[PDB]
């Protein structure tokens, strides 16, 4: 399907963020969507799924500085945390992904990149 | 927790190319291999290391299974030129790996 | 019976409280189906799942050898019983068939003469709230990883309880305790009253589906009256520097108008009532239950062997005791309350004693339990009896020796 | 053993059976293991329950040094040097390919009891590569050893005397390994026999000689009886009921099982003592030896029998003797609704006996069914009776006999 | 004490040992909160929470009733009710403390709270499960979902149900006059008893006796319904050693006259303390290395005939007819080993020879010299210390003092004596 990122990329420090991401086209409601992240350099870093039932699950690296939003109706979901430091300079994809067995994964599906670029 | 054979292959056109991730710890359930590709938007292609992906060629596969795991390919081709990676999904932070610099090779 | 003229003697009795027994009885049958039927689905079963079955199973039914014995009678009242299953077997067997591919409907209420058989499954409420997992959320593998563990889970706890006691039966069924528990006969009594009552059995059993067949009875409460309870705790009292007792049994009773000892072991205390079926009336010696009905001049009595508070003991708020194991110091003023050598005790009243503090422990007056007056005797120390029988042994041997010696 | 009489007095003789003793003293000793498997390393919670269990044997280590603890310290010292040999072997075997491994010669076994779960570890394997995770594997194992170690610690908490007693029997154990060892325990010791005396293992005791504080295992000497018949020795079981007198029910008295041989008997107490189809099991033939008047109210002048009062309960209606019935109708009233009449009052009696032949179903109480009927029985006999032994068992009641007994001999002694 | 003579009629009397007491009443409190914490239910477990609310208003609710029942003529009936009831008025005073501290744990997950307000009187607290649910934490989030998580919480909480009710064992609706016993809460958590039984305040004697603290029980004081809360006085001792005090063992080995295996009754333990003779009842009461711990004064008094019996005067000693135990037949005594060498054919292979009794001797000691190989079925043995022979043997014995100890057999025997009675001066 689609998915799709929006909202603005510049952040003066320990500041609110929150940004956007909507689907074009699929069925909402029916499973999930998560959210990952990564620096422009290195690494991969997962931050926290969203459930349809209004339901998020974190990663303690990033414990009790997050939340995640749910949206039936526009068929989007977005993000809301708090701690907005320097060092998470880096890109916010989206995920959409699918049930297997034991428990579910997120992945990458479809995100261009969120072009985040916090700054003093 | 997972990590990269190679952070790099400088592997020419027509060959076998391939990996070996190895689960710390060592662990059964399973990795989706998926590229990144700087430039575009990336996507999931191996779920459950052989049900490749809907509509992704049967040049890739995966042939593995617990403590570490490994590609097969042959047939190689430049449009596959873009960092993979690899994961664990049963320690529930969903854990990647470094990364795999693929570079073809032949310029022209 | 008489409290008034026992007061003198170290007696107290706690309070009049009747009975409330069993004695209509509502036998019901309950059978027991296992494995929880996965929501109408596919795609997953296991063998441990079934692993258990033929273990417990075959523990229990080679044990039908002690049943034919029909050819302490608890042997031919549970014969009695074990017919009446027989009698109702096939309908027992008519609603197995029906309930046991039905794969839903954990609990039936048939009702077609009495209550229906339940025929509690296991695990099924659970179940229902597992599928959703199952289905539309993951595969039925995550399932089979929850549901083995569960059910194992709840394997292990029959194994502890399987002459069962039926709140560990319902304990396997913890929401399902109270709604049949309270419902099954129609419970306008005190629901309480009979979460107190515990006996639960088997029948038979089959081994092919492996469910498990029980006769459950579940009585009713029938208020005994004209008949109350009575508790009992005696204390010291001396005698030419002699602490003696005097022996008798936890509880007493009057049944009707006649009186009688109380065995209330079996049964729980209430504010008015002791749930035990059997009525225990066990007779004991006219001598001494001449005592109880007044005549206290023939009591039994004995040497004291115990701790010290059974030495001293509260009656009414005013305080009763021997006054020399415990220097009786009423603080009017506070100063010792020695006896004379006749008596043992004395029963000391809203006199002076404003806020005793005996032994260090200051506490309130206002007595109210009347008859602030001693007690003269004769010289009544007549049943000087003894409890252990090597002390009667030794007594009576040398009553042996004496007549013996004076026979010649 | 005038079952005729008994039968008219009250005292009933039911199922008459067999005895055997195991006298015999087979050892053979058989330990355990507290560590199971893994493969590369999961320890996903190992470590989270061997402290745990080093603290359970916390009270278990201690020693110190008596008719039993010669016993218990004498085979033990001439196994010492057994011991002493196994501890080599011990050594060799503490860690294993295979759960259910150990092997000696001297036909004699060692085999241990086991890697306490390692069966169902050995199930547990095969999810745990290609299909599930360490996280899962750990979290069925630390359950699967909590549940474990409870079902350890009802057998054996601790040391401090009278647990160890009524502690580690080897059908604990047994209860404790149930899953593993229904099938095999017959065959962990040579021995076979029929199910219910040798291949059950009456109930045995067995002490533990040494513990292993840095390995976590204890050294059980199993003991394992030989059993042998004993002939001309059965026994005439023994049960009472009630029997009314002069209006009032009174009863006698006996102990719950007996035993006769050729001409000595005893009331034998089998407690520890498992009964059968046709022949119990004690370790050693019990002593319960009687009164020459008991014996005599048993097998002779029936008029010596005792009489005492009941108190607790109406043990009548179980009153039924070959077919037939005994009991107390004289005042637990009785009807026979077929062939119908009340049945009577003779006030002598206590017990009347009715034959299948003469009621064709009798009544109790107020219900009414019919056993086979046809077995064998007969009565006609009337009879008067001696008095002369009124006894009782209320210690109260003794004593203050003996008190007025005391008076009357004290106004004679004066005069 | 006659220790010696006695050795020709069945007897070993072990040693002397020593005594203490718990003098006085040194105490700290206990209170629980039988809920486990949880930092974030984002909708995870809290049915089974509920399940285990639900199951704990049976055990918790009695409990309630019969604290209610405790108070006397109030100062705002039976025997050991006035002890109870004092002491609960004295922790009234520190009422203010508890009270003021419980909500302490509540506002804050914690395994074990010391919150004190002295150093040496401090009042702690335990949380049910939480040492457990430190790393139950962990499959709820980052190693797993909360699904199954919830049903290890479940079955967790289902065995320590289960632990609590075993020991606070509604057998009655007015149970609370027993005792519950401290190592039932010392198993409650698993793993704390050797650091709280050992830290609670000042505790310095070893892992012996006074940190083996068996017959102790403990009270219950605030029982609360909607927090599911208990408190308990928890009394602690303090041990010093008690006078002149010689505590013995008893045992009674048959002597057999003319086939008949009889044997002296005696307690299990005989003390000795100046003047002070009787046999304690010290089951409840620790066996230590040399010196009894019993909290009480167990000595009390019993027939006379038995004093002269130990005292020396030998001959009032009573016989007693019997099947005897397997017990009564042999052991040793410290070198001198003694049996009943007309049953048991003490054999002495060296010098090889079955060992002579006559019927008049009812036993007879073989020491270490007379014999080196005391012989019976199972001797390869150790033969070194003094069991003196001290009794001018052989000696005339006397039978005078014989009885009976079953009750119906007495019955007989005094039913023959009032036949012999209503005979004699008729």
Redesign the interface.
């Given at each position: 399907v689609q998915l799709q990122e929006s909202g603005p990329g510049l952040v003066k420090p320990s500041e609110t963020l929150s940004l956007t991401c909507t689907v074009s086209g699929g069925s909402v409601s029916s499973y999930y969507w998560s959210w990952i992240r990564q620096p422009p350099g290195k690494g991969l870093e997962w931050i926290g799924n969203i459930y349809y039932s209004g339901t998020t699950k974190y990663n303690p690296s990033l414990k009790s500085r997050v939340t995640i939003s749910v949206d039936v109706s526009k068929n989007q979901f977005s993000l809301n945390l708090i701690s907005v430091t320097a060092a998470d300079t880096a890109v916010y994809f989206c995920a959409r992904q699918v049930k297997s067995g034991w428990f579910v994964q997120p992945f990458d599906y479809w995100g261009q990149g969120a072009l985040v670029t916090v700054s003093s | 927790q997972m990590t990269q054979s190679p952070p790099s292959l400088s592997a020419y056109v027509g060959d076998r190319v391939t990996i070996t991730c190895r689960a710390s710890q060592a662990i059964a359930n399973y990795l989706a291999w998926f590229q990144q590709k700087p430039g575009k938007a990336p996507k999931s292609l191996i779920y459950a290391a052989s049900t490749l992906q809907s509509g992704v060629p049967s040049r890739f596969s995966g042939s593995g299974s617990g403590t570490d795991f490994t590609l097969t390919i042959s047939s190689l081709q430049p449009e596959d030129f873009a960092t993979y990676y690899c994961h664990q999904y049963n320690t529930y932070p969903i854990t990647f790996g470094q990364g795999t610099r693929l570079e073809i090779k032949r310029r022209t | 019976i008489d409290i008034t003229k026992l007061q003198h003697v170290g007696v107290?009795v706690?309070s009049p409280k009747g009975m409330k027994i069993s004695q209509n009885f509502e036998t019901r049958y309950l059978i027991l189906s296992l494995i929880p039927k996965i929501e109408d689905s596919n795609s997953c079963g296991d063998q441990?799942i079934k692993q258990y079955k033929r273990?417990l199973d075959r523990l229990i039914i080679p044990l039908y050898?002690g049943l034919k014995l029909?050819?302490?009678?608890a042997?031919?009242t549970a014969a009695?019983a074990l017919?009446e299953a027989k009698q109702a077997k096939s309908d027992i067997e008519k609603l197995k068939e029906a309930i046991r591919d039905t794969n839903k409907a954990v609990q039936s209420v048939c009702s077609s003469v009495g209550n229906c058989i339940v025929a509690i499954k296991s695990v099924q409420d659970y179940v229902n709230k597992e599928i959703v997992?199952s289905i539309?959320?993951?595969?039925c593998?995550?399932a089979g990883?929850?549901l083995g563990?569960?059910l194992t889970?709840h394997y292990?706890?029959l194994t502890?309880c399987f002459g069962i006691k039926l709140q560990c039966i319902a304990?396997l069924y913890?929401?399902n305790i109270t709604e049949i528990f309270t419902t099954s006969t129609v419970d306008k009594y005190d629901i309480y009253d009979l979460?107190?009552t515990e006996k639960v059995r088997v029948i038979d059993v089959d081994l092919n589906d492996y469910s498990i067949t029980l006769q459950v009875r579940l009585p009713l409460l029938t208020r005994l009256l004209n008949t109350q309870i009575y508790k009992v705790?005696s204390?010291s009292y001396n005698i030419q520097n002699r602490e003696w007792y005097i022996?008798l049994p936890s509880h007493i009773m009057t049944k009707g108008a006649f009186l009688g000892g109380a065995d209330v072991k079996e049964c729980?205390?209430?504010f008015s009532s002791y749930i035990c079926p059997s009525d225990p009336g066990?007779?004991?010696?006219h001598?001494?239950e001449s005592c109880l009905s007044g005549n206290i001049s023939q009591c039994?009595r004995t040497t004291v062997?115990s701790?010290i508070?059974?030495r001293?003991?509260?009656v009414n708020?005013g305080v009763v005791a021997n006054c020399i194991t415990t220097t009786c110091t009423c603080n009017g003023i506070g100063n010792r309350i020695n006896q004379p050598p006749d008596q043992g005790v004395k029963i000391i009243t809203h006199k002076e004693c404003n806020?005793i503090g005996i032994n260090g422990?200051?506490?309130?007056?206002?007595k109210e339990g009347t008859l602030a007056f001693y007690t003269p005797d004769d010289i009544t120390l007549?049943?000087?009896?003894?409890?252990?029988?090597?002390?009667?042994?030794?007594?009576?041997?040398k009553?042996?020796?004496?007549?013996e010696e004076?026979?010649e």
């Open positions: - | - | 107290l706690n441990q273990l050898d029909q050819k302490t009678s042997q031919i009695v017919v997992p539309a959320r993951l595969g593998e995550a990883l929850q563990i569960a889970q292990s706890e502890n304990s913890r929401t979460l107190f705790d204390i022996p729980i205390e209430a066990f007779v004991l010696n001598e001494m039994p062997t701790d508070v059974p001293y003991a509260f708020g806020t422990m200051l506490f309130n007056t206002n007549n049943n000087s009896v003894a409890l252990d029988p090597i002390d009667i042994s030794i007594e009576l041997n009553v042996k020796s004496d007549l004076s026979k």
